[PDB]
Design a protein that fits this description.
metal-binding, alpha/beta, binds the ligand O=C(NO)c1ccc(Cn2cc(CCO)c3ccccc32)cc1, 36% helix, 631 residues, 16 strands, binds zinc ion, 8-stranded parallel sheet, binds potassium ion, EC 3.5.1.48, 18 helices
């Protein structure tokens, strides 16, 4: 029922700055804040967001995560002169203090709680807080690495206290390790902390052994801390996506968080002087998009680092875009994660195995600019059986031109000599694909259909000439859809009930063994289907479901995540009217929140799945989550 996206920001937080020479802190400037809001303003995004005001955090809230004696000593800094401010800062590592910083720290904190409250009160669906100073390095009795108070720690503690939450997921995709967040929730199994970070075998700041993958939490919270150390600079989109598909997402969907909070720092992005990675801003559209099916979309993005005043704004804009539901940009050039990343991913997956199901089976600069993401006027066209009419969210619509109608005549004579109300299915399929591929008006659609074969063929062939350079086809059924995969412009994902050994590397054919069937599907969706689809980079996704064929629990999740491919251009062909299935498909297509899920897959199922990884990862390297054996 919740709508919109909150943007919490206030120019006051840029009214503190470093007052002495120190090359460690020079990079953390007020302009980081004004650049990112200005970038949100320029692209129409901030205007499209519910502005929620900033508040100060109360002392009672600050004591949730900080010690009175630390709070007392910081409380004294607004009265310090500059010589005194330098001395107080030297008691800490990589942090400076300013007469206004205690003020803005309470604002950065309070802005986060505001965001937590807005999201949790259903007043918005998600949101983002542009704040200074950052939080994730801050610890219970010290400032650290530009942080005074742990803004994201507050949010989770505060949502625990005030909304009685049991399961919070913090995703820290900053390039630095959020050690303050690890410390704070180390023994807490209700807060699941994932952080990737530049490590370089402990030689990169903050130089902590606890920053390594060996740290999994302590006491009753072991398994709820997940460190992914990058041991080389220059990580790429393919590395980041591998991290999500083979570590974070599999754990995150199993955890089923009741709320997701992001330490969104963008020093993890190409051009950042500190992070020195190579991921494009566009990756952050997908980072965000891949987590939105969690917690019914209740996601609180919070700003940490990011220091290239140009790499910064672009990644902010990509995050808010996806928060607002705008189409994700296609990521091209994806492939294998580099070997150092495969090493880290391999190790972290292995030490975590004793605690998670998806892994349990292994224990036996100058860049280009990010285009523009025009939101679609009518996001989702719907085409129910003739006569039947349904209730559609405001961004949906129903059904034919003469030009369209002759082409059906054309196709009839050439390919289907024996021809009713199917030449309506065919007629709409064309106009929806025409509306999708031609105009950026309709974005995706769904069409209920009678004959499978005539309709899928006409759909796929009309798409290949649209032009769609490549079509990803995902079919839930047991037949053999007339989809030739010789040319390599078509990849096919078949989810059937009968084992059917695939021969070649442009089909992926899974046969699951019934209670198991949901948790089996999700591991395969995150482990196999999403990595291949993302490497393939289709221009259009073709969804198909057979009348005959427990895939009412997962279709929403798959319909949501598969829209990260193909600018969100999916066309779903449902055989047979099913009020709940159509309503669910249209809901996911149109952008609604996906309701959460909740039994670990059968061992025969994990076994079949990595048969398919083995058979396919030489071609589709984003499938890999171990270092390659070298002959
Ligand atoms: O963004 C952050 N955390 O989220 C963050 C960023 C940097 C620092 C401390 N530091 C400062 C520099 C100056 C070079 O330009 C430097 C260089 C190498 C390693 C460490 C370095 C703390 C936190
Ligand atoms: K991080
Ligand atoms: K924890
Ligand atoms: Zn950082």
């Amino acid at each position: 029922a919740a709508s919109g996206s909150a943007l919490i920001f206030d120019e006051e937080m840029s009214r503190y700055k470093l007052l002495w020479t120190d090359p460690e802190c020079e990079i953390e400037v007020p302009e980081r804040l004004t650049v990112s809001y200005e970038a949100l303003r320029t692209h129409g995004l901030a205007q499209r967001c519910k502005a929620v005001p900033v508040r100060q955090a109360t002392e009672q809230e600050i004591l949730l995560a900080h010690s009175e004696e630390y709070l007392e000593a910081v409380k004294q800094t607004p009265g310090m002169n500059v010589e005194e401010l330098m001395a107080f800062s030297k008691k800490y590592n990589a942090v400076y203090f300013h007469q206004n910083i205690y003020h803005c720290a309470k604002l950065a904190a309070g802005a986060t709680l505001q965001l937590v409250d807005s999201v949790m009160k259903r007043e918005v669906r998600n949101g983002m807080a542009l704040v200074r100073p950052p939080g994730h390095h801050s610890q219970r009795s010290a400032a650290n690495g530009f942080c005074v108070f742990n803004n994201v720690a507050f949010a989770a503690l505060y949502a625990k206290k005030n909304y009685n939450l049991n399961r919070i997921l913090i995703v820290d995709w900053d390039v630095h390790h959020g050690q303050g967040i690890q410390y704070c929730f180390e023994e807490d199994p209700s807060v699941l902390y994932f952080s990737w970070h530049r490590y370089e075998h402990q030689s990169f700041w903050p130089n902590l052994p606890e920053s390594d993958y060996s740290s999994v939490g302590k006491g009753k919270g072991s398994g709820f801390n997940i460190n992914l150390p990058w041991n080389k600079v220059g990580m790429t989109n393919s590395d980041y996506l591998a991290a999500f598909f083979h570590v974070l997402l599999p754990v995150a969907y199993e955890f089923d968080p009741e709320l997701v909070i992001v330490s969104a720092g963008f020093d993890s992005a190409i051009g950042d002087p500190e992070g020195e990675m190579c991921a494009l801003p566009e990756i952050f559209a997908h980072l965000t998009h891949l987590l939105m099916p969690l917690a019914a979309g209740k996601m609180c993005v919070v700003l940490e680092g990011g220091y290239n005043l140009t790499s910064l704004g672009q990644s902010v804009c990509q995050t808010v875009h996806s928060l607002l539901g705008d189409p994700t940009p296609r990521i091209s050039g994806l492939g294998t994660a580099c070997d150092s990343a495969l090493e880290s991913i391999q190790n972290v997956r292995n030490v975590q195995s004793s605690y998670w199901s998806s892994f349990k089976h292994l224990a036996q600069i100058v860049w280009p600019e990010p285009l523009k993401r025009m939101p679609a006027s009518v996001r989702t066209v719907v085409v129910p059986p003739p006569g039947v009419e349904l209730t559609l969210p405001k961004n949906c619509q129903h059904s034919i031109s003469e030009s369209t109608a002759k082409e059906v005549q054309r196709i009839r004579d050439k390919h289907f000599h024996d021809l009713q109300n199917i030449l309506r299915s065919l007629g709409n399929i064309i106009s929806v694909l025409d509306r999708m591929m031609r105009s950026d008006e309709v974005c995706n659609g769904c069409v209920v259909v009678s004959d499978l074969s005539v309709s899928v063929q006409c759909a796929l062939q009309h798409a290949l000439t649209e032009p769609a350079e490549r079509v990803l086809v995902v079919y839930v059924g047991d037949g053999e859809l007339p989809v030739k995969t010789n040319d390599g412009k078509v990849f096919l994902v078949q989810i059937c009930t009968k084992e059917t050994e695939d021969k070649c590397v442009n089909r992926l054919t899974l046969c699951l063994r019934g209670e198991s069937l949901t948790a089996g599907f999700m591991q395969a969706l995150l482990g196999l289907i999403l990595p291949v689809a993302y490497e393939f980079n289709p221009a259009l996704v073709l969804g198909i479901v057979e009348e005959t064929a427990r895939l009412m629990r997962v279709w929403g999740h798959m319909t949501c995540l598969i829209q990260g491919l193909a600018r969100g251009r999916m066309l779903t062909l449902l055989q047979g009217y099913d009020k709940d299935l159509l309503e669910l498909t249209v809901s996911a297509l149109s952008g609604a929140s996906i309701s959460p899920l909740g039994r670990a897959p059968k061992p025969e199922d994990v076994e079949m799945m990595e048969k398919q990884r083995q058979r396919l990862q030489e071609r589709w390297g984003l499938l890999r989550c171990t270092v390659s054996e070298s002959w």
